[PDB]
Design a protein around this motif. Sequence first.
Motif, PDB file in Angstrom:
ATOM      1  N   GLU B  33       9.877   9.103   9.206  1.00  0.00           N
ATOM      2  CA  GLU B  33      10.474   9.039  10.532  1.00  0.00           C
ATOM      3  C   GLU B  33       9.682   8.224  11.547  1.00  0.00           C
ATOM      4  O   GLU B  33       9.912   8.389  12.749  1.00  0.00           O
ATOM      5  N   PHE B  34       8.766   7.359  11.119  1.00  0.00           N
ATOM      6  CA  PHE B  34       8.025   6.487  12.030  1.00  0.00           C
ATOM      7  C   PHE B  34       7.922   5.102  11.406  1.00  0.00           C
ATOM      8  O   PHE B  34       7.026   4.861  10.579  1.00  0.00           O
ATOM      9  N   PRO B  35       8.801   4.169  11.777  1.00  0.00           N
ATOM     10  CA  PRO B  35       8.872   2.879  11.079  1.00  0.00           C
ATOM     11  C   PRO B  35       7.705   1.934  11.325  1.00  0.00           C
ATOM     12  O   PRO B  35       7.665   0.871  10.700  1.00  0.00           O
ATOM     13  N   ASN B  36       6.767   2.251  12.217  1.00  0.00           N
ATOM     14  CA  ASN B  36       5.691   1.313  12.511  1.00  0.00           C
ATOM     15  C   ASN B  36       4.351   2.014  12.672  1.00  0.00           C
ATOM     16  O   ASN B  36       3.486   1.530  13.408  1.00  0.00           O
ATOM     17  N   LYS B  37       4.154   3.145  11.997  1.00  0.00           N
ATOM     18  CA  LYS B  37       3.042   4.019  12.343  1.00  0.00           C
ATOM     19  C   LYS B  37       1.693   3.509  11.835  1.00  0.00           C
ATOM     20  O   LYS B  37       0.661   3.885  12.406  1.00  0.00           O
ATOM     21  N   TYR B  84       1.528   0.193   5.534  1.00  0.00           N
ATOM     22  CA  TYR B  84       0.459   0.933   4.892  1.00  0.00           C
ATOM     23  C   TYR B  84      -0.733   0.029   4.638  1.00  0.00           C
ATOM     24  O   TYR B  84      -0.732  -1.150   4.996  1.00  0.00           O
ATOM     25  N   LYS B  85      -1.760   0.604   4.019  1.00  0.00           N
ATOM     26  CA  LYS B  85      -2.909  -0.167   3.579  1.00  0.00           C
ATOM     27  C   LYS B  85      -3.619   0.587   2.471  1.00  0.00           C
ATOM     28  O   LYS B  85      -3.484   1.804   2.350  1.00  0.00           O
ATOM     29  N   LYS B 103      11.395   1.103   0.434  1.00  0.00           N
ATOM     30  CA  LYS B 103      11.476   0.753   1.869  1.00  0.00           C
ATOM     31  C   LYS B 103      10.154   0.956   2.619  1.00  0.00           C
ATOM     32  O   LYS B 103      10.124   1.420   3.760  1.00  0.00           O
ATOM     33  N   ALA B 104       9.048   0.560   1.993  1.00  0.00           N
ATOM     34  CA  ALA B 104       7.716   0.729   2.558  1.00  0.00           C
ATOM     35  C   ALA B 104       6.940  -0.567   2.398  1.00  0.00           C
ATOM     36  O   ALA B 104       6.739  -1.038   1.275  1.00  0.00           O
ATOM     37  N   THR B 105       6.506  -1.142   3.512  1.00  0.00           N
ATOM     38  CA  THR B 105       5.659  -2.322   3.466  1.00  0.00           C
ATOM     39  C   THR B 105       4.251  -1.911   3.063  1.00  0.00           C
ATOM     40  O   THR B 105       3.725  -0.903   3.536  1.00  0.00           O
ATOM     41  N   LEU B 106       3.650  -2.680   2.168  1.00  0.00           N
ATOM     42  CA  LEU B 106       2.298  -2.430   1.701  1.00  0.00           C
ATOM     43  C   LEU B 106       1.366  -3.495   2.273  1.00  0.00           C
ATOM     44  O   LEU B 106       1.810  -4.446   2.918  1.00  0.00           O
ATOM     45  N   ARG B 107       0.060  -3.282   2.098  1.00  0.00           N
ATOM     46  CA  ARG B 107      -0.959  -4.279   2.425  1.00  0.00           C
ATOM     47  C   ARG B 107      -2.221  -3.924   1.658  1.00  0.00           C
ATOM     48  O   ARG B 107      -2.907  -2.976   2.028  1.00  0.00           O
ATOM     49  N   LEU B 108      -2.573  -4.689   0.630  1.00  0.00           N
ATOM     50  CA  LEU B 108      -3.768  -4.354  -0.137  1.00  0.00           C
ATOM     51  C   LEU B 108      -5.048  -4.885   0.487  1.00  0.00           C
ATOM     52  O   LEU B 108      -6.093  -4.888  -0.174  1.00  0.00           O
ATOM     53  N   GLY B 109      -5.013  -5.318   1.739  1.00  0.00           N
ATOM     54  CA  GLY B 109      -6.228  -5.812   2.342  1.00  0.00           C
ATOM     55  C   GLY B 109      -6.387  -5.497   3.810  1.00  0.00           C
ATOM     56  O   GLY B 109      -5.559  -5.876   4.644  1.00  0.00           O
ATOM     57  N   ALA B 133       6.551  -1.498  -3.942  1.00  0.00           N
ATOM     58  CA  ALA B 133       6.716  -1.554  -2.496  1.00  0.00           C
ATOM     59  C   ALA B 133       7.923  -2.412  -2.113  1.00  0.00           C
ATOM     60  O   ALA B 133       8.765  -2.758  -2.944  1.00  0.00           O
ATOM     61  N   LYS B 134       8.038  -2.742  -0.829  1.00  0.00           N
ATOM     62  CA  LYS B 134       9.094  -3.622  -0.341  1.00  0.00           C
ATOM     63  C   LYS B 134       8.561  -5.022  -0.062  1.00  0.00           C
ATOM     64  O   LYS B 134       9.068  -6.003  -0.613  1.00  0.00           O
TER      65      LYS B 134
END
Lengths: 487, 248
Positions: B33-37, B84-85, B103-109, B133-134
Amino acid sequence: LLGWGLKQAEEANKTPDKPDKVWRIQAGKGFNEFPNKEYDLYKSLLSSKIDGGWDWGNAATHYWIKGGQWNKLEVDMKDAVGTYKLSGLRNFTGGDLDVNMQKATLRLGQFNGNSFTSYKDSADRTTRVDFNAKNILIDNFLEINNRVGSGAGRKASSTVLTLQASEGITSSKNAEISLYDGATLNLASNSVKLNGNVWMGRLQYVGAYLAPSYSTINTSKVTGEVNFNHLTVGDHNAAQAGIIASNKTHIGTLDLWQSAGLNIIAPPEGGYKQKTEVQPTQVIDGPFAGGKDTVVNIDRINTKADGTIKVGGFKASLTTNAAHLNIGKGGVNLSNQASGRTLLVENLTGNITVDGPLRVNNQVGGYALAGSSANFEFKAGVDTKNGTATFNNDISLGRFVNLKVDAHTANFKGIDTGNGGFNTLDFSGVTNKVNINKLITASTNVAVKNFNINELIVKTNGVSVGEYTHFSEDIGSQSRINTVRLE
Amino acid sequence: LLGWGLKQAEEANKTPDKPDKVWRIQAGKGFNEFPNKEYDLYKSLLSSKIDGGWDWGNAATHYWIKGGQWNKLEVDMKDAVGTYKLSGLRNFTGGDLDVNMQKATLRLGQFNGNSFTSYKDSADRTTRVDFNAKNILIDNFLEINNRVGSGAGRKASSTVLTLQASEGITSSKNAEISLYDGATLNLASNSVKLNGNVWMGRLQYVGAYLAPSYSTINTSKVTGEVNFNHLTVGDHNAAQAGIIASNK
């Protein structure tokens, strides 16, 4: 080191144990025909299948169930009428009590306190101590997951108390509820009113100042009026307590520690609800949003602060998911040692309404020295960015104290920084509006992006120079000052 | 010494493992429920059932799953929305991650790179590290099948990374993807555009100049526009890399 949001979520869903020798004790006839007889539980019933003893290694007393701490028992009264007592069950190791007492008043205090602890075995056992009385009325002190012997001997693993009365759980004044490093408890009556010293987190041993020491008072089922009176989180350690309440939490005096956390979490909107082997599903929860009518009326925040000197502060914190965080007439205290003691009055998805004087070192002015940078901090509606931080009382700052507010709309009624000076009066997180009614500055580091201070007083700095009113960022386009009156 | 055409063909069809203690972790309410947290993965979720440690013998960090490197876990979000990260999971030994993040953006760095390696046991295990991920957006360096300690200690067996986003896998400029002696990876998004130093084959140890050191970037599923920017095959050894691309 893991955090409380992982710990309470991972002990929220466990299988209880694997106990062999499930003892079953039933109170038959005799108990159910004297409504005021004032029985006992240990000597009259429970000492049949609970044995005493001595732990070799610095003990005082010792209690388990039967032939070891891995045996469930139960008491199934269901019609026993009267009033009862425990009165002296200390250093209970045991495992899996559940004293089922319908229409029976309980009392966990008479001339002596109680204790409920487990041992650190290789099986990693809990206790799951249940009670199902009608009233409870703790009425003396109680330790949960305490120190069994004295430091040495066997260590103490986690535990669970569970108190599920049907009419209310009051408490006496000298009833210091003190749950420790691994302990939790749940309440399920209506209108819990603990009038005693609630003590979440304590030194489990004599000198272990670096324990994580989590706790939980998950009053999730309380359908009435939760009313604490006196909390205390942390004792010479970095305890991280947490409370999952039932959208009404009127407390009184709160006594945090320097490096102690608190997580008052309101309920959600609609309320709650040679072979491979499959572990059960560990459902976890992130920081969610509280419901609409979630009220947390913390009416006094003190702080204990003494000890050594670290390279920073320690940043005590309470995190609130409620849609209101009202703080009444007691205001906010801050004890300050030589370094800079800091508190974080944070609100994730709600509002903050402080109506009390911001004290420090327990006075209204509160001068601090150069190394002791006392830092007030407020976060109204972080993850929604529509949360207001309204201070409807005239605040008063001394010297080397620093207010900052990172909210959506930070209304005010009066700010006094001209008496002490050296006040970083930060507002860098404010979205659109700052309604300061009256400002008094000597050496201030105001940084507002947008405001309308309808009356401005700029006082001097005595005779020394280098101290002045300073707006240290962009003032914007919708800014306004309806009255400037230099003296 | 065998050749890459034998090696990629013999690790193309294997049973994954035989893991006991299949942990299952599900992200329930609060995340969705928080699209930019801007959450985290390790500290917020994954450090519950991934333990740190110290390898006795020239290590820096050490990570496995639970009570040894032979236990599958999974993360089943399927509705968690935001970004995320990972940010600092180094010398992961572990085994059988599969972080299912629809529907989740990832970031491995973020401020630190990553690592994914196995140990050379007597069971000859892989890792089969999956992500679903997305977007992914590696955005910092990543080592696959690296050197766990420093030369000595326990050796490193093969591994698999698998990145199966649904919108694209870009990369930053300082994101040196460097897979080693036994590592492979697969991609399954559309329009992969790795703008970083891709480094197939590296010295796994300090002086072993005579390792075979195969690798594979099997971008077989990429329905868009594969666009690498800077490869590097081999480093002071006879590495034999290979890419099974998608006809562009």
